Amino acid sequence: KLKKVLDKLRLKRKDISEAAETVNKVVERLLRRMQKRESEFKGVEQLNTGSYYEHVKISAPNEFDVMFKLEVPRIELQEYYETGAFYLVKFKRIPRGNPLSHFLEGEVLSATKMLSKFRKIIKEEVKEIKDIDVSVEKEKPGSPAVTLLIRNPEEISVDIILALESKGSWPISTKEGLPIQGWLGTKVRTNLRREPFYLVPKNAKDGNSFQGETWRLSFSHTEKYILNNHGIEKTCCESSGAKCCRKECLKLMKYLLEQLKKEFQELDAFCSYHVKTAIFHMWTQDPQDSQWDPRNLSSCFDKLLAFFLECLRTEKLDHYFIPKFNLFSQELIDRKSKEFLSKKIEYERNNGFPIFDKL
Amino acid sequence: KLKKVLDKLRLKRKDISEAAETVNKVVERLLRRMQKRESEFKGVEQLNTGSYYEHVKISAPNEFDVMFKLEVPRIELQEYYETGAFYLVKFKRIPRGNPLSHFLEGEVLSATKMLSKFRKIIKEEVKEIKDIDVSVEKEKPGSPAVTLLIRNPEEISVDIILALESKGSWPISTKEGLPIQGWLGTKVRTNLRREPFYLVPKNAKDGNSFQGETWRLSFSHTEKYILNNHGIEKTCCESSGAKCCRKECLKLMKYLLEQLKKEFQELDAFCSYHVKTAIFHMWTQDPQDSQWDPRNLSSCFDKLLAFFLECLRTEKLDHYFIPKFNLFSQELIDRKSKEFLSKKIEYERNNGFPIFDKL
DNA sequence: ATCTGTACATGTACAGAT
DNA sequence: ATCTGTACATGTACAGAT
DNA sequence: ATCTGTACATGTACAGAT
DNA sequence: ATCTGTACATGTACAGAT
Numbered sequence: 197k198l199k200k201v202l203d204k205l206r207l208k209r210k211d212i213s214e215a216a217e218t219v220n221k222v223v224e225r226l227l228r229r230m231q232k233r234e235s236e237f238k239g240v241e242q243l244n245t246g247s248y249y250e251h252v253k254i255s256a257p258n259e260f261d262v263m264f265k266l267e268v269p270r271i272e273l274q275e276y277y278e279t280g281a282f283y284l285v286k287f288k289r290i291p292r293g294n295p296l297s298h299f300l301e302g303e304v305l306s307a308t309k310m311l312s313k314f315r316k317i318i319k320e321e322v323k324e325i326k327d328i329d330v331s332v333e334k335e336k337p338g339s340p341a342v343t344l345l346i347r348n349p350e351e352i353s354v355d356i357i358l359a360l361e362s363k364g365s366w367p368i369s370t371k372e373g374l375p376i377q378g379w380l381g382t383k384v385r386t387n388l389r390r391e392p393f394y395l396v397p398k399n400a401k402d403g404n405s406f407q408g409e410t411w412r413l414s415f416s417h418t419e420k421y422i423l424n425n426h427g428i429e430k431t432c433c434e435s436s437g438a439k440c441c442r443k444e445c446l447k448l449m450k451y452l453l454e455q456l457k458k459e460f461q462e463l464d465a466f467c468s469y470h471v472k473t474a475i476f477h478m479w480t481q482d483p484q485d486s487q488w489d490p491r492n493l494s495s496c497f498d499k500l501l502a503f504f505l506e507c508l509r510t511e512k513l514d515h516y517f518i519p520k521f522n523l524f525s526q527e528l529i530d531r532k533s534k535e536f537l538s539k540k541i542e543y544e545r546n547n548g549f550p551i552f553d554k555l
Numbered sequence: 556k557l558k559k560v561l562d563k564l565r566l567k568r569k570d571i572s573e574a575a576e577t578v579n580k581v582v583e584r585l586l587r588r589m590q591k592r593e594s595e596f597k598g599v600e601q602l603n604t605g606s607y608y609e610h611v612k613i614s615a616p617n618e619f620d621v622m623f624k625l626e627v628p629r630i631e632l633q634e635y636y637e638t639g640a641f642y643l644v645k646f647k648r649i650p651r652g653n654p655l656s657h658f659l660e661g662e663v664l665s666a667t668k669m670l671s672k673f674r675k676i677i678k679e680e681v682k683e684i685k686d687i688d689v690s691v692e693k694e695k696p697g698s699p700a701v702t703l704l705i706r707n708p709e710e711i712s713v714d715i716i717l718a719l720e721s722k723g724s725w726p727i728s729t730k731e732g733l734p735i736q737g738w739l740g741t742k743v744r745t746n747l748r749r750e751p752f753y754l755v756p757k758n759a760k761d762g763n764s765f766q767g768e769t770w771r772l773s774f775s776h777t778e779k780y781i782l783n784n785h786g787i788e789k790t791c792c793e794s795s796g797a798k799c800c801r802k803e804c805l806k807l808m809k810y811l812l813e814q815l816k817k818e819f820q821e822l823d824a825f826c827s828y829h830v831k832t833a834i835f836h837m838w839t840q841d842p843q844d845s846q847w848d849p850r851n852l853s854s855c856f857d858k859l860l861a862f863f864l865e866c867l868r869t870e871k872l873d874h875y876f877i878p879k880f881n882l883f884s885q886e887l888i889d890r891k892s893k894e895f896l897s898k899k900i901e902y903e904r905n906n907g908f909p910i911f912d913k914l
Numbered sequence: 915a916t917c918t919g920t921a922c923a924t925g926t927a928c929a930g931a932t
Numbered sequence: 933a934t935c936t937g938t939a940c941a942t943g944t945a946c947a948g949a950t
Numbered sequence: 951a952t953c954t955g956t957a958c959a960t961g962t963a964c965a966g967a968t
Numbered sequence: 969a970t971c972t973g974t975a976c977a978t979g980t981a982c983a984g985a986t
């Protein structure tokens with residue numbers, strides 16, 4: 197039943213090969229451009245993130261996410277009023293003459309300006325490439341990405357995401373986040389929090405305050421580690437261990453949402469990150485690998501579904517790394533929208549998911 | 556029962572404080588002296604190893620192992636007669652002002668010369684210490700250590716072990732070693748094998764060829780890791796996890812052997828590394844954390860005893876990292892000594908462990 | 915001036931103490 | 933059940949080197 | 951400092967086994 | 969139907985070389 201759907205969603209070796217050689221050509225070229233050109237982004241480094249590199253991409257290999265991360269030195273952060281996830285970045289002491297002088301304002305590092313130069317460089321280099329059909333997608337407000345459209349023959353999107361890499365303690369808003377103690381352990385949590393944290397040029401809204409200079413926290417690196425080290429036993433899904441169905445529940449849920457979203461404009465507010473967050477919480481609630489036995493795929497998916505509905509009903513979905521940050525606040529997502537998704541999901545669930553059969 | 560014995564073997568904090576303050580001073584001063592002038596050992600680095608840092612030291616904190624390890628860049632290893640564990644080290648390059656030219660014995664690096672110099676410097680530094688009563692112990696045949704004897708009132712041994720560090724991949728003799736795949740897993744094993752490997756002086760005084768140019772492999776770093784990360788579950792012995800009794804079993808077995816060795820000179824051939832190796836094999840054999848439940852301390856200890864007895868009776872105890880290196884070979888330990896230990900352990904096992912009550 | 919090796923600063927798992 | 937000393941990892945300050 | 955080489959994890963594919 | 973085992977492919981870490 198769901199086995200058949202997973203067979204459908206499973207990427208094909210040839211397709212992965214073909215898509216990857218092309219994306220890697222383009223990304224390589226861009227990345228070389230960033231340092232080989234005496235730019236203000238010299239020293240930038242590649243970190244692949246997201247579904248494809250987490251092995252939870254479904255249907256086709258047509259979306260690739262990449263961070264270009266730049267080690268900015270000692271910076272001071274300021275919480276963009278009690279969101280937890282948004283900040284203004286100032287320099288403790290401006291060492292001066294540095295690459296990012298012209299991105300500053302009043303001791304503040306403007307996300308908009310820096311992103312716009314990043315973008316300008318990217319468009320410029322993209323015009324300079326002749327063996328691949330590749331263009332730059334129109335900018336979306338509220339997006340930290342510069343997105344590329346490649347037509348191999350087939351359509352592939354690539355998000356190039358500029359990120360500041362900071363090596364200090366994680367911000368205090370994350371102190372109670374990443375609650376993996378009973379699941380992946382305290383040693384894993386402590387190690388993960390010894391890793392750098394990332395800031396991303398996503399603008400905060402209202403259109404009120406310092407919208408354009410605002411950055412946002414990102415833990416794409418931590419999420420990648422988790423997705424690939426997801427068991428309570430060290431050998432989960434390893435060649436000398438036993439398979440679980442955690443990844444496949446993520447795939448099915450992502451598929452449900454993708455399908456519902458294709459059909460219904462009313463679901464625009466919702467996204468795959470909501471599903472990823474919800475399953476992270478579920479993996480926390482039920483840490484034992486035995487609670488994700490492949491033979492229990494259906495019930496596992498069902499429990500995931502019920503949890504998601506609960507989140508819609510209570511209108512609460514806390515960011516996994518930032519507890520105070522409610523992804524389903526009435527501010528972010530309209531109540532009517534959550535009732536709508538609730539009803540659609542309940543429909544599909546109660547009728548053996550007809551929408552898994554269509555295209 | 557055995558729990559009361561473990562209560563007796565538990566180290567006291569006040570003792571730990573006292574011993575560690577002194578040990579750390581002396582080690583600190585030696586490492587610093589090595590790091591000075593134009594000594595051959597400049598660049599040497601410190602790695603604390605063995606029981607005390609594995610948290611399996613018993614009775615008193617009166618023994619400390621510390622590795623002074625030196626990276627040796629270009630390096631070629633020749634195996635010593637298919638023994639798996641023993642090698643000659645050759646620099647197939649030119650000195651270029653090499654600090655180790657002085658120890659070169661025509662293409663090869665001499666263990667005994669290097670050790671001799673290391674030791675001479677240590678002795679010299681120890682003379683300049685007037686705070687505490689610390690002396691250098693008479694050299695022991697077959698020992699890669701310069702041993703210090705500190706009278707901190709209480710007598711304390713500090714083994715300063717000279718080591719060569721190579722960052723290349725491990726020698727082929729270890730390919731089928733470290734069989735942790737069904738226990739700690741493939742990712743863990745790959746990571747450990749990405750770590751450097753060590754070489755320490757064999758320093759036998761037997762009389763055989765290449766006696767003073769023979770080094771032995773060492774993985775005390777890896778062993779430390781395994782001891783501190785010993786569960787199939789990432790949360791084993793953590794604060795949101797379940798305690799197991801693996802280390803407690805190691806403690807009991809170490810204690811049985813120590814008591815017997817102090818009573819009977821017949822057991823000089825045996826050492827604690829034998830029980831460490833046996834228990835690593837047991838942990839591979841019985842990988843589930845539920846096979847080391849604290850409630851089953853007697854059973855677990857007993858199965859360990861049973862296993863160990865067979866090793867004596869079949870004359871086989873494979874080095875965990877080097878399969879073909881048999882620690883109980885006829886050539887290392889006499890059948891009489893093995894029979895003697897077998898009978899001692901059998902007796903102990905079948906009559907309440909009276910030796911646990913001694914002293 | 916600027917640079918950087920050394921060692922202090924901070925955090926927490928582990929396991930003894932109370 | 934909580935409190936707490938050691939070992940250990942990583943971030944960062946500044947003296948003395950350049 | 952930038953790059954290639956090596957090893958092995960993560961995947962898919964598909965013929966022969968259960 | 970599912971499992972197993974071999975072949976096939978990419979992603980990622982990091983030693984070591986110029």
Ligand SMILES: Nc1nc(=O)c2ncn([C@@H]3O[C@@H]4COP(=O)(O)O[C@H]5[C@@H](O)[C@H](n6cnc7c(N)ncnc76)O[C@@H]5COP(=O)(O)O[C@@H]3[C@@H]4O)c2[nH]1
Pocket residue numbers: 246261336338339340341355357396398412413414415416467468469470
């Ligand atoms: N990845 C991610 N992290 C979030 O915290 C987040 N919050 C909302 N969303 C939305 O989920 C959807 C799917 O994300 P995808 O990864 O496929 O592409 C994302 C991703 O490649 C990148 N991106 C967005 N936020 C971040 C982030 N915090 N860190 C790194 N990359 C990010 O920009 C793309 C678009 O972001 P948005 O147009 O703002 O909204 C996304 C998107 O609609 C998020 N997506």
Ligand SMILES: Nc1nc(=O)c2ncn([C@@H]3O[C@@H]4COP(=O)(O)O[C@H]5[C@@H](O)[C@H](n6cnc7c(N)ncnc76)O[C@@H]5COP(=O)(O)O[C@@H]3[C@@H]4O)c2[nH]1
Pocket residue numbers: 605620695696697698699700714716755771772773774775826827828829
């Ligand atoms: N650690 C260790 N690794 C071995 O492969 C080995 N083979 C035999 N032995 C013997 O176990 C006994 C207890 O070891 P301990 O750790 O307390 O002190 C050891 C330890 O501090 C150190 N040492 C010995 N072998 C090594 C080694 N291979 N690597 C690092 N250090 C070592 O020098 C001390 C004396 O060594 P030996 O007199 O050669 O024989 C030892 C010892 O009699 C070994 N011990």
Ligand SMILES: [Zn+2]
Pocket residue numbers: 426427432433438439440441442
């Ligand atoms: Zn798994």
Ligand SMILES: [Zn+2]
Pocket residue numbers: 785786791792797798799800801
């Ligand atoms: Zn344990």
